[PDB]
Design a protein around this nucleic acid. Structure first.
Ligand SMILES: Nc1nc(C[C@H]2C[C@H](O)[C@@H](COP(=O)(O)OP(=O)(O)OP(=O)(O)O)O2)c(NC=O)c(=O)[nH]1
Ligand SMILES: [Ca+2]
Ligand SMILES: [Ca+2]
Ligand SMILES: [Ca+2]
Ligand code: NA
Ligand code: NA
Length: 324
DNA sequence: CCGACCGCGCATCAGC
DNA sequence: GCTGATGCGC
DNA sequence: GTCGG
């Protein structure tokens, strides 16, 4: 919490730009600034000092000097006191309510969870589920629970067909102590770029059959987004409901997918910048060679995460060591 | 100065 | 009925 | 809002 007041302020400004101004690039600018400042190992003494960090520019340096001298930001103070902005900001915490729906709801006097619960007819299916689990979806997931969730998913997937490959990615695969949701990448040897039906559906159905998956936000042939819950013992309290995504990826793009969806964002960026310096380009699907004039060639064969590191002559980085 | 800032799968809607 | 645009999440 | 061409 060296500069926790500054990072809190920048995050509040970010959330305002995202939810109220509908300016996703300023949201990400403020987020970027807050991240580098949370990494900085000194209590910032001036805006000029922070401005030396990448992502901190002139207007953020100005806000830091105001916050340092006064302990507050009058832009934020006015925003907090604006009832419309505060209601729009709150409503976007419902999964499925974005800035457009939030503003539309607030315009017609729908401002609170109660107002939403009163107006289920004006909600689409996703929004109804987000409202249903409003508190649960904002809880984090302890790693011990993730581990238990991974066991169910891998086991039920194996039960459908032994040849499925399922990998839990995101912050969990990087070894985090808690996760926000569960990210599952699924493949099968029979599904390639140049190619069985219902491959995702059968896994989703089996997980519903054992009452692990409890709700569906969206589902198609390659991506499922829904809700799941660990089973409870007959004497203890039930578990929170959890967000879970399952994506079906072709096997020849699978390990590029695992690489991408493990992250982190900073690590992917560093790994792709290094790939370029070696004459390769990595995206979420493929690694391709670069010709002399920057033309990408055909995708290279990838049987594992390690193959990707080998191509660019990088020693394998363990998922836990991929924070950057 | 000024354009880019990831962009795609799914759900939903406006227009044909 | 269809297609393309958009909101949303990530 | 920040960055870079
Ligand atoms: N789960 C998920 N992630 C991404 C983004 C990629 C790049 C990112 O470094 C990596 C993990 O991002 P994610 O939002 O899952 O964050 P994570 O590190 O898992 O933290 P948390 O979810 O809070 O536990 O996946 C997606 N694609 C685009 O954003 C996606 O559809 N689903
Ligand atoms: Ca995640
Ligand atoms: Ca609950
Ligand atoms: Ca993408
Ligand atoms: Na939302
Ligand atoms: Na997330």
């Amino acid at each position: 919490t060296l500069n926790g007041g500054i990072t809190d302020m920048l995050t509040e400004l970010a959330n305002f730009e995202k939810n109220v101004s509908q300016a996703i690039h300023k949201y990400n600018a403020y987020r970027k600034a807050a991240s580098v400042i949370a990494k900085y190992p000194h209590k910032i003494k001036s805006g000029a000092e922070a401005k030396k960090l990448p992502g901190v520019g002139t207007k953020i340096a100005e806000k830091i000097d105001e916050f340092l001298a006064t302990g507050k930001l009058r832009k934020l103070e006015k925003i907090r006191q604006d009832d419309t902005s505060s209601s729009i900001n709150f409503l976007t915490r419902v999964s499925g309510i974005g800035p457009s729906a939030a503003r539309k709801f607030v315009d017609e006097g729908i401002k609170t969870l109660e107002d939403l619960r009163k107006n289920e007819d004006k909600l689409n299916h996703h929004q109804r589920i987000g409202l249903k689990y409003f508190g649960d979806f904002e809880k984090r997931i302890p790693r011990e629970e993730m581990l238990q969730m991974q066991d169910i998913v891998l086991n039920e997937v194996k039960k459908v067909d032994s040849e499925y490959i399922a990998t839990v990615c995101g912050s969990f695969r990087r070894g985090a102590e808690s996760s926000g949701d569960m990210d599952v990448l699924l493949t099968h040897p029979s599904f390639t770029s140049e190619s069985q039906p219902k491959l995702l559906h059968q896994v989703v159905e089996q997980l519903q059959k054992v009452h692990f998956i409890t709700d569906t936000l969206s589902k198609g042939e390659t991506k499922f987004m829904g809700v799941c819950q660990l089973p409870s013992k007959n004497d203890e309290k039930e578990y929170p409901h959890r967000r879970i995504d399952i994506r079906l990826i072709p096997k020849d793009q699978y390990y590029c997918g695992v690489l991408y969806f493990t992250g982190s964002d900073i690590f992917n960026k560093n790994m792709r910048a290094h790939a370029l310096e070696k004459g390769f380009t990595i995206n979420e699907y493929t690694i391709r060679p670069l010709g002399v004039t920057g033309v990408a060639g055909e995708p290279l064969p990838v049987d594992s995460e390690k193959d990707i590191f080998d191509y660019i002559q990088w020693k394998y980085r363990e998922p836990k060591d991929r924070s950057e």
